[PDB]
Amino acid sequence: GETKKMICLVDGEHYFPVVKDSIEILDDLEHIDVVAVVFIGGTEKLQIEDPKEYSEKLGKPVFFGPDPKKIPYDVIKKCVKKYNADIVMDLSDEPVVDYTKRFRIASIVLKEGAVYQGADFKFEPLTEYDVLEKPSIKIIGTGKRIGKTAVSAYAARVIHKHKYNPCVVAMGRGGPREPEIVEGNKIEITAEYLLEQADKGVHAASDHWEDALMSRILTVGCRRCGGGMLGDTFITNVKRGAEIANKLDSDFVIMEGSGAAIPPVKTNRQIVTVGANQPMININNFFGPFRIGLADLVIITMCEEPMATTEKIKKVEKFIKEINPSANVIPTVFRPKPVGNVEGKKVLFATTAPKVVVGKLVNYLESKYGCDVVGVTPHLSNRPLLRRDLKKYINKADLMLTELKAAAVDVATRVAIEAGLDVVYCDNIPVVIDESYGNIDDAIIEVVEMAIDDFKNNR
Amino acid sequence: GETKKMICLVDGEHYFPVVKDSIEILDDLEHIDVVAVVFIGGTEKLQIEDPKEYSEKLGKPVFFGPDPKKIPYDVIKKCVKKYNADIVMDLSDEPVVDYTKRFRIASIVLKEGAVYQGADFKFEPLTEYDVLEKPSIKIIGTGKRIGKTAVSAYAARVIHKHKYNPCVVAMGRGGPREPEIVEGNKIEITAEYLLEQADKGVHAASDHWEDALMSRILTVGCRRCGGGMLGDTFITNVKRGAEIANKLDSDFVIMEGSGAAIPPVKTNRQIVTVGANQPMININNFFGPFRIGLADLVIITMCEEPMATTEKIKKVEKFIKEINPSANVIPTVFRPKPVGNVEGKKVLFATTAPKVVVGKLVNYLESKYGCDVVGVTPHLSNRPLLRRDLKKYINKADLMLTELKAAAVDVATRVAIEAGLDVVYCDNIPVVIDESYGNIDDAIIEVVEMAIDDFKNNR
Ligand SMILES: Nc1ncnc2c1ncn2[C@@H]1O[C@H](COP(=O)(O)OP(=O)(O)O)[C@@H](O)[C@H]1O
Ligand SMILES: Nc1ncnc2c1ncn2[C@@H]1O[C@H](COP(=O)(O)OP(=O)(O)O)[C@@H](O)[C@H]1O
Ligand SMILES: O=C(O)[C@@H](COP(=O)(O)O)OP(=O)(O)O
Ligand SMILES: O=C(O)[C@@H](COP(=O)(O)O)OP(=O)(O)O
Ligand SMILES: O=C(O)[C@@H](COP(=O)(O)O)OP(=O)(O)O
Ligand SMILES: [Mg+2]
Ligand SMILES: [Mg+2]
Ligand SMILES: [Mg+2]
Ligand SMILES: [Mg+2]
């Protein structure tokens, strides 16, 4: 039993006595103390004229914005810090706040580690365990199949080229209760080895297995359930994974998220992935802006037709620069890279990609690697339709080129090995669309250097 | 302390064992029982071949949609009803749910009186006291200055013409702890009477005062603080206002809201006001669709340039009919009606209306009532600029025509009475833009008849 420190957000669209009654009712609760009050706008009542008049009558310190027509975001942030608030309680309404303004206020309050709540809603700030004994980056994103894993694999290779030994702790959508370690820095991960793991009941197409193969690195397979609006998760073993990663042979750590969910482990720096294919409201409203606000570097992905228009790409770029002008921003597209040789082969291509981009990926594969793609399955995520596509194409291909994602091991690899084909795993590589935005390796190196410098200087 | 019945929302983007662990963790909590699970979509992490395995392995009943690509909204609603669930717990994430899908799920769950919550968020359903002993309508809206009061005054007069005696309980953002009673059916409310009230410290420009004067009815002045996202309020005396309304001389009750807030008293039927001037996201996302879903009749307001484009008005109409197909929908604009005679007089017009629409209101006043508008103040909300306009124009006018809103009594009426002018109070009348949408009085009568029929039969 200890009191929670509450800041009240109030407005001049309410008459002061009903506000005073509300603050006295909140303060007179057991386990709550109202420590400050912020007037967030409105002027219908100005009979009480002076912040010191309001403060005298409340017996609480009272804060106002420089402009009564605008939400005093900076004053709310400064007040939550100054009074070290546990809770910010919203006693406002239209016209002073709409949903957009509430999510803007929420994004500030939750970042300072305070609860944001009102009459009918509550938001919990992200728990964040300070457990890593190595310099580190978080790789998070706004959704699924936007390239969090693809960017993470690439970043690991860049960090290796920079003469560091990276470990990826991947927060996946399942896995053993004790996090599993994959020594992709020591072990030759083949199709037959992945099937041997799948036969033991191991989730061999998970991101830790993919990053181990695609980037030849040590990885730790963690699990989670649920992924909230702000990005928190219901249960996870990622804290245990970060503890494991400390003890193993590595000298840089990537904490990689899943879906819109954020690993609850403190890192020196953060890379945020944003698919230009996603609705603008998911990027510029709700807790999109909160996620973009965490970034040192933003990778915008899917920056091409048919996935996004030029105007959409420019709108996403413009918004990111407005809300996070400190962040470096790189717009990108994904292109395939086989982890093996496919030159002059008849190729069956297996992917999770949208059907509208398969033609472009095939055109690229044939033009660059000199293969002939005899058939495609975009159904790695759908086991019945996958088997249908395999029976159609399997006989006319020399080898199957597959993403190491979804049913790629226990269905597609199994069928291809029993049919006597070679199986080559396929990475997705982030390629910069526009050289005016500079080089993606240099952008990652900048963030890696910041993470190392931060770790050396802060204890 | 009593056990709360929880339904879990789960997906096939999580591997079964981490979902099972999550459900066992939730069920093993004190005063929570997991009673059912709804599988809301996704496929790739289903190694389970038969959906019956899922329920067998959880030891919980599990319900599925007909289409694994779509959220089974209907199944969620049917299960919350069937189990009389207190909580719905979201153990999903991107790609299966985005923010929009979560607000669609929230709107269903909260309407059935269940909490909706996830990893980092919680939403509380509306408190609703069952206290009225008379047939009744709630008049609520999506914002401020969208015409809730204007529609409410009109509805009261329509109910009077239909041979009933209506009472308006107005939930404002201010007023005495004991609700204030105004007998506008028995008292001739003059400018001098309103100044006598303002000098006693009464909020004479409040909605209960306005409805009393504009509609010559009994009204009860209630107060509240805060207005949440769903529309709940932190504190209010509206329960006491409804108890007062039962005792007094009336045979129909209108419970009128304020801002986006909803009076927490049960009513037979609901009228929802939606300003077409508001951003589409506030109408078609968050808890706009929840508010529109409460409606028997939706009044769309501000349906003209400069406030809304024809395309906007059509988008609002189309959306409302999609989410609430049995609701009657009437698109409208507001025009002045003096509560007195202004024919051939020199008029100083005082309003809270935007500068961009004053010309249309003036053009209407002069064309309909044959007055000469010698000047306008759009500054009833801004006491300094109001006095500047009054000093300029007061000498030119025979009478001041004013909305009974904001500084209309304690500044504008006071200056006009001391300057020896007549003061005429001005209603805002909802006018239907297109006769193909039918007559607004008939639309109100339909809802009033439903409220009377419901009241007679639900006893
Ligand atoms: N040019 C492209 N346009 C659109 N999608 C692409 C393109 N190239 C690859 N993809 C798809 O992008 C996705 C990247 O997925 P992944 O790296 O697993 O990201 P995440 O961790 O965000 O799910 C895959 O589904 C892949 O097939
Ligand atoms: N034609 C019009 N276009 C736009 N606004 C108008 C028009 N006519 C009146 N108004 C304004 O509409 C508002 C209606 O306010 P009111 O009836 O108090 O509704 P609420 O209770 O929702 O605030 C007032 O500010 C009034 O001046
Ligand atoms: O499940 C899917 O991805 C496709 C079906 O794939 P095909 O059977 O057309 O290959 O759904 P659709 O796009 O037809 O609505
Ligand atoms: O706050 C309230 O009591 C009412 C009126 O405000 P005022 O007209 O008294 O400023 O709000 P609304 O019905 O306009 O949303
Ligand atoms: O407050 C307002 O609406 C007016 C007041 O100034 P005047 O209209 O009295 O000049 O300024 P604006 O917003 O048009 O710049
Ligand atoms: Mg207390
Ligand atoms: Mg991934
Ligand atoms: Mg329990
Ligand atoms: Mg009103």
Residue numbers in the entry:
A (entry chain BBB), B (entry chain AAA): 2 to 460
Passage from the reporting paper:
To elucidate the substrate binding residues of cDPGS, the structure of the 2,3 DPG, ADP/Mg2+ bound enzyme complex was solved by molecular replacement to a resolution of 2.2 Å resolution, resulting in Rwork and Rfree values of 21.5 and 25.6%, respectively. The 2,3 DPG binding site is located between the C-terminal domain of the one protomer and the N-terminal domain of the other protomer of the dimer. The ADP and Mg2+ are clearly resolved and reside in the pocket formed within the C-terminal domain. The 2,3 DPG is clearly resolved in only three of the four protomers making up the asymmetric unit of the crystal. A phosphate molecule has been modeled in the active site of the 4th protomer. The Walker A/P-loop surrounds the pyrophosphate moiety of the ADP while coordinating with the Mg2+ atom. A superposition of the apo- and ADP/Mg2+ bound forms of cDPGS reveals a large movement of several α-helices that close around the nucleotide, which highlight the significant conformational changes that accompany ligand binding. The helices α5, α8, α9 and α14 show a motion of up to 8.5, 7.0, 6.7, and 2.6 Å, respectively. A closer look at the active site revealed that the closure is triggered by the binding of the substrate and ADP which brings the Walker A/P-loop close enough to contribute to the stabilization of 2,3 DPG. Residues K145 and R146 move closer to the substrate to form multiple hydrogen bonds with it.
